[PDB]
Symmetry: C2
Subunit: 303 residues, 2 copies
């Protein structure tokens, strides 16, 4: 009945500036509330308005802005379970996500992940791990799933000395992998730090050199991850955040998983170690390697 | 302090606002012709000082953004983008390259070559020669010449003679003469090729597609069958490609967008009709069951 170019270009402007206002409100709520507060909001939303909040966002958000929003609406253990289930695509496939989660979680966190996995997918996380890995990698990951790591406060100096000697002899092929599995999975992080410094004194190498020389493949990555996590877990995640950005493609899945799951664990320590390690802030590199509403949400999560 | 009722109320306000704002964007991107929204894109830049495509990239995401930006490009430019994205190695896959080059007229092949030069400072013919191989390279370059006969006359003597040539080029015990198939399927008219196919059926007893499936292989076969099917019934070709791109939980949504967008003002209404007859269900219904979110609303709106 009459093409009005000025009318159409006007309500497009009104709609676009409305998108930015609403997304700003969504970003404000998701990045300004704790996980428990977000759970209270999500429950109150469905009671008052009769719809599941996660469902409403699925129908109006897209891309990595939607993935981050739904990740923040899950419990940290639930999103970790969704990440593990998504990454297990058969034997021989990439295992980095399974190594990252299991080698950096406490006993209570691993138990919460195993509970979430069983509830979300009607199967045990251990069964899928046994069917997706093999060799000594299966042993160590299934071992970590037992969630029985020593988590006391005390250090046994004589035990740290004996473990260091046993780890060196296992690299020489005495009584080659069962010793690394037992020490790295069951000793406390504080006990392992004493074990590593004793290994440096006795042998002359740091334990990471010995691992790089005596192991390879995904098993080496798991041992190095357990060592890095016990010495400085914030430095580990800072490097994983950095390496996931170098490139125009950018593994944004790793970016979301680390920022969301570690938010109320050690995200502030990760940001400090990141600045000290790369002379740039983690937030500054998000702006350099992301864009759109997804960048705006991550920057808000980094404060 | 922390007010749960306030934040949930603020969220419901922001959620209803995004539904309203997206409805306004969908109603315009699907309610205006390509020329009409080309004026809106330039009018938006003059009135508000920001390019519309850049404003949408910062607020839209996913395949909703991909469709929105596809509707704001000329169908020649978006076809050139699809070629540049799918071109990434000597082997790889050539589905997008075969689909576009074997279904466009001379006027449309030129506009893609022009847009590809303007967008990427590169020759589309040059990039094809580096990505393709074998006789698939020779036929796709031959289509890029945009010199196919587009007359209305049909030479019945030539249709019968080309039919004999296409049979002799596949019955040679030395090797299938692929240079002869590249000649007929690329330079004869669509209406001329139909007569060539009818003559081949009468002379040989096999359909021309049955002869291709047992005398060529790989992507060269896919290029031939695409040329035959678009010359025979191009609305039925895109009807199948739309159907098979959705049969599955994965759903190739890139192909779904590329077809609906590049063929919107060409023969999309003919594609929708052939889809209904071919599968007993409308394209709008199958899209409604194999997509979700604001991406589904924008597709349903594009199908009217």
């Amino acid at each position: 009945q009459g093409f009005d170019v000025d009318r159409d270009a006007k309500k497009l402007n009104k709609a676009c500036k409305g998108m930015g206002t609403n997304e700003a409100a969504i970003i404000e709520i998701l990045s300004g509330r704790t996980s428990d507060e977000r759970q209270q909001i999500k429950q109150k939303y469905k009671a008052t308005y009769g719809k599941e909040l996660e469902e409403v966002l699925k129908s109006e958000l897209s891309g990595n802005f939607e993935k981050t929003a739904l990740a923040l609406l899950d419990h940290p253990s639930e999103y970790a379970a969704r990440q593990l289930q998504k990454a297990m695509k058969g034997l021989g496939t990439d295992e980095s996500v399974l190594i990252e989660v299991l080698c950096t979680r406490t006993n209570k966190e691993i138990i919460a992940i195993k509970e979430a996995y069983q509830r979300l997918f009607d199967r045990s996380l251990e069964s899928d791990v046994k069917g997706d890995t093999s060799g000594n990698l299966k042993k160590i990951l299934v071992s970590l799933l037992q969630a029985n790591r020593n988590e006391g406060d005390d250090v046994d100096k004589d035990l740290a000395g004996q473990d260091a000697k046993d780890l060196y002899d296992a690299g020489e092929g005495r009584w080659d992998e069962l010793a690394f599995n037992e020490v790295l999975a069951k000793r406390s992080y504080k006990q392992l730090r004493a074990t590593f410094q004793a290994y440096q004194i006795l042998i002359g190498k740091d334990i990471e050199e010995a691992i790089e020389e005596e192991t390879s493949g995904d098993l080496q990555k798991a041992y190095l991850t357990l060592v890095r996590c016990a010495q400085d877990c914030e430095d580990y995640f800072a490097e994983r955040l950095y390496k996931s950005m170098k490139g125009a493609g950018t593994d944004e899945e790793t970016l979301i998983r680390i920022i969301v799951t570690r938010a109320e664990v050690d995200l502030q320590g990760i940001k400090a170690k990141f600045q000290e390690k790369y002379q740039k802030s983690l937030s500054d590199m998000v702006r350099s390697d992301t864009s759109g509403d997804f960048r705006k949400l991550l920057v808000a999560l980094l404060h």
